[PDB]
Amino acid sequence: QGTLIRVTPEQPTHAVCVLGTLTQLDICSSAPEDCTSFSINASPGVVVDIASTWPLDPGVEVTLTMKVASGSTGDQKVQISYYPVKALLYLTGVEISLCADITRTGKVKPTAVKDQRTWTWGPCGQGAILLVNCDRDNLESSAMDCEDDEVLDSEDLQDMSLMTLSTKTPKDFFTNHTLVLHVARSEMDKVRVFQATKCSVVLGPKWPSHYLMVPGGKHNMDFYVEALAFPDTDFPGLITLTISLLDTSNLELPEAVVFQDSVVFRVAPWIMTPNTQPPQEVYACFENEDFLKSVTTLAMKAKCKLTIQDEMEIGYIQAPHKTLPVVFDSPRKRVMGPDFGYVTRISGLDSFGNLEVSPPVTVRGKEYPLGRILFGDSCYPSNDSRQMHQALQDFLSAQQVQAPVKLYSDWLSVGHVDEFLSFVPAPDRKGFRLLLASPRSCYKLFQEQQNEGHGEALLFEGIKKKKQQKIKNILSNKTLREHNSFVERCIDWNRELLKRELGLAESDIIDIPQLFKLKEFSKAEAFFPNMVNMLVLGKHLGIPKPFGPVINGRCCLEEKVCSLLEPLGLQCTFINDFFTYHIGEVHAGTNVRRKPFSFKWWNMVP
Amino acid sequence: QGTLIRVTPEQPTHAVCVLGTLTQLDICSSAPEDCTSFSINASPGVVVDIASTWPLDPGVEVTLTMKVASGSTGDQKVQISYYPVKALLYLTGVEISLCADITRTGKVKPTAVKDQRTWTWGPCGQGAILLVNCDRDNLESSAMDCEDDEVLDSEDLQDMSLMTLSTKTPKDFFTNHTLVLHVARSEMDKVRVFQATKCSVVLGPKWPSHYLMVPGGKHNMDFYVEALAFPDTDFPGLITLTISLLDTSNLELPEAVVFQDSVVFRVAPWIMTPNTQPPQEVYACFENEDFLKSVTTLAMKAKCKLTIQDEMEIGYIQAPHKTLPVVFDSPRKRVMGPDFGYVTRISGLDSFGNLEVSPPVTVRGKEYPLGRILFGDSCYPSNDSRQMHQALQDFLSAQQVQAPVKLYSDWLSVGHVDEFLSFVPAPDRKGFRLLLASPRSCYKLFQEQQNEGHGEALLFEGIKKKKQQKIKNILSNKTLREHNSFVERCIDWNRELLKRELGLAESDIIDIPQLFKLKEFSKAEAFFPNMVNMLVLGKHLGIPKPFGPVINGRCCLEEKVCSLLEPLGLQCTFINDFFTYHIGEVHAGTNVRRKPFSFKWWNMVP
Ligand SMILES: CCn1c(-c2nc3cc(C(=O)N4CCC[C@@H](N)C4)cc(OC)c3n2C)cc2cccnc21
Ligand SMILES: CCn1c(-c2nc3cc(C(=O)N4CCC[C@@H](N)C4)cc(OC)c3n2C)cc2cccnc21
Ligand SMILES: [Ca+2]
Ligand SMILES: [Ca+2]
Ligand SMILES: [Ca+2]
Ligand SMILES: [Ca+2]
Ligand SMILES: [Ca+2]
Ligand SMILES: [Ca+2]
Ligand SMILES: [Ca+2]
Ligand SMILES: [Ca+2]
What we know:
Chains A, B: Ca(2+) 5 binds at residues 311, 329-330. The structure is a homodimer. The first copy, chain A, is mostly beta strands. In chain A, 12% of the residues lie in helices and 34% in strands.
């Protein structure tokens, strides 16, 4: 933001000055050796702040400041007299300002002095936000918008960030000078820049620099910027665009740089939405025709739109100008469309049933207003242990805003985290509760009902293909009781893990009755349909119907589940067929889209 | 750091307790439904902090604390009585502490509570330091020490960090329990761990976990840790080792986790040394036999060891226990040895003449006590522009401690930064000065000597193969004067760049007389031997002899160079043949090793 000019008496000096930059003078280096003093006078447009004739000591600082842009080339003068011989200096005032939404308010602001071309997190920080163009507004084009080098629809401009170049110079100022917009060679494959007139490519992959065609006088120019890559292990998420003013008055000599200015964009990360957030839409996809009814009733009850899943997770990206949903598809078919993004980056833990996120929490000082991502892993790497692909773990950690927590889920047969934990909206305290499966909770009910005389109750009743099981001989099973004692020990481990990494007290956790049967390789499957895993649409739940032993009319499992959830204000609605069997895979067909956080992601300091 | 135990009246509960971890009791979950109150008594060794019989409300917190390690299994008891039915709890106190030099003092300290297994920069931060094993103490082995899986010499242990596992448990405690040391699967290729008895590999590449063989009783165990990779774009520089306590009492059931503890190591980065640092050794390598003399005189004068270069840079890595020099070799033969490291990670800007570092500076608040790395680059990427390989730039930025500054040097023919800038030790102010080549400085002398009557002086005098040039017709050359006006404009650009990124005033910069001749493709070579580039060994300089025009006995160029450097207290010693010509490459054979910073790198906060 500075420029040093050296004037000499033998030859007049011509210098360009950009409004907003400090300019100092070097009059000592080329001063007459017999001269011991000097004095300076200049035109009204030129202001001198030097710190009545001065003794030409090297320590003196001659500062120059120009009021406004020049109407002609060298229309401002500076006379330097030595003590006599005079030295001349012809100055031209020009305005070169590169502007972007650095205040994160939706409106473009010029370069303001506190930013210093550095991106900073927080409410008191500065830096523009750039979105990944990962959707498909153009209904005709089947590919992604960022895969080509053209702007097809006007609706696509809403997704791109705006950048303006306003210039006020003399008319004949551009016959010997030139402007060039450029980006680093490492960042060029992540960003593409358009010039609006009607849009053409100036910057992008294999095009790091481009000469600009501007006229003299007062002229502003609009640019539209798009991102082509999410933040990852090889891309922190910053893009820096730069304008440069070059002197080309010498035909034989290469171009000389006179002025540079930059703006720094940050690529918006992918953010998940917890169950506590309101649902915008419910997605569903031969069987369970009656369950489609029970599903449609719940959506109509919770006032949520329904349209006709475990392999994908619906997130979003947001900027001050645009906010749209983006679906992350597991590696284990892309739904691109208007305001619908898509991103893609093999073990059984790579599926997104193993991928969940907590409500906003505060853990021992650190605030997580966007919650924390939760995924499962082994307790320690062995030959027979599984883990989520490192490439996937890196992506989630690269998004930064939602600090991932590694849980233990390798004990389960499937290995997903959603099958032993869940979150529900609560009226008091934190505003939510943590639902954890509990064998101890399930056993207590069965033993209490055995003492109640109804120990002859047969489970699996009213089922087409199932074996009746009595409460009496279920409690008398020494094999099942040992396994559910081992499973409880696993959930207890994760219980204390979540209590520490989410800052949860026991008064925020609710134990839900559930027991498991050991499979081959000592893996764990649910003995009856997993109730802790469900469909949460606000105050309305959609728990799978447990089909537990009938006692005095209604199922005792549902009675306890309701007894724990009704005081929260949660309307329970048990579904006849939530999960379905294949061929040997148990799946669920429901998936939700929820309203993004009101909290802007760029305001937290990771 | 917690563990929740649930006792039941129908069956006694046995529980293991690690000294240092908080333990809470769950007596409500399995309490008799008819019971409304309870009371607890325990052995003297067990301490209860509950917050005179209690009403069994869920909100009550029963906390347990054990004084010391158990001498026998379940030698401490806890009786829980309900109101009556009693529930039992047999406890075993064990000590499992993993220790490392987390205080960065050279001595191993246990896990202290403020660390929380998180590495933190600064004097008030915590975290152990790990060095890359990139040297070769074993004189016989030709390869690097970290390339194999064995500890050959006792001298090699000084380079490795120490980690201890101290355990105090009952004797029969280990027949049903087991300990396992492990590291993440992503970090395993960067670290190798040895167990000392005599050393064997427990952890490393393709070996993420390993069972430990410890006896019962009071027993400590030593581990030696080495790093295998410097921090890069794919490795932030953190390693996390973890110990795990497993329960294996159930033969049929898989191992259950009871306790985990970790230590976090940070891999020490590569640090450069500026000219202001004292020189430990001078390296040199047919011709200029007389110059070897003038070189040996300077080293003997500055009291520095000499032994018989531009393609390599001598840096260092340091830890609280060991500090050794490491040579970074440019991609454009490895000198491994005892306490001599080696690291390696094609354009003409990839050479390390384009790689330099500044003295310790403070720039607008931010402190850089280890200086800042300086390398050259084009002003903007064009088809005909050059740049340092992105892989190289990433490595320097990954070292973090010395923030790299991108300068402009694409104008030069060679393109190196050392041929137009240098640093010298000063007595006052900052303690250093910045030496910049200056055509304006050189022209002023020549014009002043023309006025002095000695304008008939012929340059290139006393040279075997050279053409005589007079000061008169050198100043009268309109071609040379335009080119040195363009070169000055380049150095002036970098001048303001360094003033802003190093926080330098004009009172810290010294202009050195020098001019250049344009070559093909408008590139720049020095017209006479570059003086700003030299050999700085403390107060003693080794400037190349300019062979400038002779005036009244001595060379006027040397007279001005001395006039600027002598007041600093710098003894100038001009060398007859500093640079040599090949075939078309101009090189220098000298290279220096300097004393590392007293400032420990882990104390600054990047
Ligand atoms: C109704 C099915 N069923 C179950 C049952 N319910 C499960 C739910 C999940 C689960 O939560 N997920 C499924 C995988 C993907 C995860 N994202 C979510 C996983 C399971 O085991 C693999 C489940 N099992 C065995 C038990 C049962 C007993 C009788 C009749 N039917 C029964
Ligand atoms: C004595 C040679 N010489 C020079 C001269 N001196 C140079 C030094 C460097 C330099 O600083 N480096 C060399 C490259 C690697 C960098 N790390 C450091 C680079 C140069 O041009 C490429 C130099 N030229 C042309 C000019 C001259 C005139 C007459 C007789 N001899 C003359
Ligand atoms: Ca497009
Ligand atoms: Ca779009
Ligand atoms: Ca859109
Ligand atoms: Ca999920
Ligand atoms: Ca070795
Ligand atoms: Ca070694
Ligand atoms: Ca050594
Ligand atoms: Ca160098």
